[PDB]
Amino acid sequence: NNMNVIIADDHPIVLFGIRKSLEQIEWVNVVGEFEDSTALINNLPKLDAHVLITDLSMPGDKYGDGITLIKYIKRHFPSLSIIVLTMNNNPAILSAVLDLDIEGIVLKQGAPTDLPKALAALQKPESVSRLLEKISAGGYGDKRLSPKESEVLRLFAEGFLVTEIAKKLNRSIKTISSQKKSAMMKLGVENDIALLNYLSSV
Amino acid sequence: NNMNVIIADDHPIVLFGIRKSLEQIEWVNVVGEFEDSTALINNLPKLDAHVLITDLSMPGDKYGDGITLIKYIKRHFPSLSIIVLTMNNNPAILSAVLDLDIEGIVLKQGAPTDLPKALAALQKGKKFTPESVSRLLEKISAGGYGDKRLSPKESEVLRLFAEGFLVTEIAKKLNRSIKTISSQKKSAMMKLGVENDIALLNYLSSVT
DNA sequence: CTATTGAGACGAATCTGATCGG
DNA sequence: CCGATCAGATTCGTCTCAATAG
Ligand code: BEF
Ligand code: BEF
Ligand SMILES: [Mg+2]
Ligand SMILES: [Mg+2]
């Protein structure tokens, strides 16, 4: 059958890279290419699209990025299937993204033919099973953050401050401080540096 | 006239793109596609290449990631012109990356025509510093202020802060007040081009 | 001029204690 | 129970402002 796909990446090289690879599949039609959440959300309605390809680390003055956005897309566009596609390889972040009950995750650091492997499944997941098994079978089942906790442990590595994260996600500095100091408690780290080391590696 | 190109990026979707971006240029010939800095080095002598388009942030066990690697390649593989294509948006990093005699810097956040125009400079023998790059060059650049040279104490503060120590601890630890440590930490971030603490720590990862 | 060093004012963050769900 | 969410008090850290001599 015929699907209509939206591609939402902050890097136009990767964005051209995908559309180039989705020319090969006849029944696939790329009906747009956006480079921020505000652009994605503004022209989402105007386009009849069954499925969307998005990334985690993206700019968004309004609608935010990552889990904050995936829930917002799901909320104000439930009709639309969502394929996440992230450069991030941190089990703690990924752990919370998998609960969202999205159409699938293709990793940016996975072989190129995993994206075709995703759309093949969604037409008639498998992709969302592998990581969940691997993540758990890697000895990182003791690193199961909640959505909020990941959605800070991402933004805090992006470089956004706690005051800044509270203003962007419409909570208080202390609710974020809670979710943050909670996150490190779940990971087993004490000081900002040690957290960023358990975020840099995995 | 024609050349020989290498591409090295951990994300094969980027690698798929970069390769397809140079199919548009008839006189360019793609002669390598590597993901890591271990594979890239082994096959460097085994191929006759005149240019490399490599990403800073990639996995490396034997050889480093970022500035440390570009310093090794400039040392061991000196004939080969390097263009850096990275998702990094850190003035301090990019700055220290720029001052290693690299043919040109392109960004992943930069427009798609940037890599063509960066090669168009290596076609007409010169560099392309895009809008997006120049925008970050503004941050670090000020008027004098020690010619952006860190002081003996400032250097000592960033070191400990990078070790994992807190600022109040360093105040007790280095014969002075919190004001002096904060002052000298904050002060030293203005010189390098960083603004937050996260941006500081990553610059003090590249210098390894 | 800067460098090194601060004091007081103010923000930026952590620490209890409390308030409602499956 | 713990999830998310906050309002006190209190500290960590920064900011405004300004002093030492080199
Ligand atoms: F920046 Be995304 F995680 F690909
Ligand atoms: F993440 Be890489 F530096 F492009
Ligand atoms: Mg990104
Ligand atoms: Mg990379």
Burial A59-91 (b: 16+ CB within 10 A, else e): ebeebbbbbbbbebbeeebeebbbbbbbbbebb
Tell if the CB–CB gap between A20 and B20 is shorter than 8 Å: yes
A88 CA closest ligand 1 atom index: 3
- B136 in contact with A at a CB cutoff of 8 Å? no
For residue B53, the ligand closest to its alpha carbon is 2
Give the pair of three-digit tokens for residue B202: 């990553």
Are B161 and B192 in contact by the 8 Å Cβ rule? The answer is no
Query: Which residue, A108, A107, A6, is CA-closest to A54?
Result: A6
Give the pair of three-digit tokens for residue A32: 């747009």
Please give the span between the terminal C-alpha atoms of chain A, in angstroms, as a whole number.
39
Burial B58-82 (b: 16+ CB within 10 A, else e): bebeeebbbbebbeebeeeeeebeb
The CATH architecture assigned to A3-137 reads 3-Layer(aba) Sandwich (3.40)
The SS3 assignment for A36 reads: coil
Identity of the residue numbered B55: D
What distance in Å separates the CA atoms of residue B160 and residue B156, rounded to the nearest whole number?
A: 7
**CA atoms within 13 A of residue A49's CA, in its CB half-sphere:** 26
Q: Which of residues 161-200 of A touch B (CB under 8 A)?
A: 161, 191-194, 196, 200
Query: A84 pairs with which residues across the strands?
Result: A54, A105
Are A193 and B201 in contact by the 8 Å Cβ rule? The answer is yes
The CA–CA distances, whole Å, from B109 to A61, B86, B132 equal: 17, 9, 8
Are A184 and A153 in contact by the 8 Å Cβ rule? The answer is no
Q: Give the experimental resolution in Å.
A: 3.4
Are B195 and B186 in contact by the 8 Å Cβ rule? The answer is no
**Pairing outcome for strands B30-34 and A81-86:** unpaired
Query: A33 pairs with which residues across the strands?
Result: A7
Angle at B17 between CA B15 and CA B21, to 5 degrees: 120
Domains of chain B, residue spans: 5-140, 152-207
Matching CATH number, B152-207, of 1.10.10.10, 3.40.50.970, 3.40.50.720, 3.30.565.10: 1.10.10.10
Q: CB B180: neighbour CB atoms within 10 A?
A: 15
What distance in Å separates the CA atoms of residue B74 and residue B63, rounded to the nearest whole number?
A: 13
- Distance from the CA of B177 to the center of ligand 2, in angstroms? 39
Q: Where are the alpha helices (DSSP H) in A22-171?
A: 37-42, 67-76, 91-97, 114-123, 127-137, 147-153, 155-158, 162-168
A30 phi/psi in degrees, rounded to 5:
-85, 105
Are B29 and B47 in contact by the 8 Å Cβ rule? The answer is no
- Is any atom of nucleic acid chain C found less than 7 Å from the CB of residue A190? no
What count of CB pairs under 8 Å joins A to B? 71
What distance in Å separates the CA atoms of residue B142 and residue B139, rounded to the nearest whole number?
A: 8
Whether domain B5-140 has CATH 3.40.50.2300: the reply is yes
Are B4 and B29 in contact by the 8 Å Cβ rule? The answer is yes
The hierarchical CATH code for the domain A147-200 is 1.10.10.10
Ligand 2 and B88: CB distance under 6 A:
yes
The SS3 assignment for A52 reads: strand
Are B29 and B6 in contact by the 8 Å Cβ rule? The answer is no
* Integer Rg of chain B from CA: 19
Query: Which residue, A149, A157, A29, is CA-closest to A86?
Result: A157
Contacts of the segment B102-105: beta carbons below 8 A, 24+ positions apart: B102/B70, B103/B51, B103/B127, B104/B128, B104/B129, B105/B129, B105/B130, B105/B133
What distance in Å separates the CA atoms of residue B111 and residue B132, rounded to the nearest whole number?
A: 8
Residue B187 belongs to what H/E stretch? helix B178-192
Give the pair of three-digit tokens for residue A76: 């104000």
Torsion of CA B162, B165, B171, B172, to 10 degrees: -150
Residues from chain B that touch A156, judged by Cβ atoms under 8 A, are 198
- Is any atom of nucleic acid chain C found less than 7 Å from the CB of residue A175? no
- Distance from the CA of A8 to the center of ligand 3, in angstroms? 10
What distance in Å separates the CA atoms of residue B3 and residue B96, rounded to the nearest whole number?
A: 28
The DSSP annotation for B26-86 comes to TT--EEEEESSHHHHHHTSTTS--SEEEE-SS---SSS-SSHHHHHHHHHHS-SSEEEEEE
What distance in Å separates the CA atoms of residue A143 and residue A202, rounded to the nearest whole number?
A: 11
A87 CA closest ligand 2 atom index: 1
Query: Which residue, A147, A182, A124, A173, is CA-closest to A68?
Result: A147
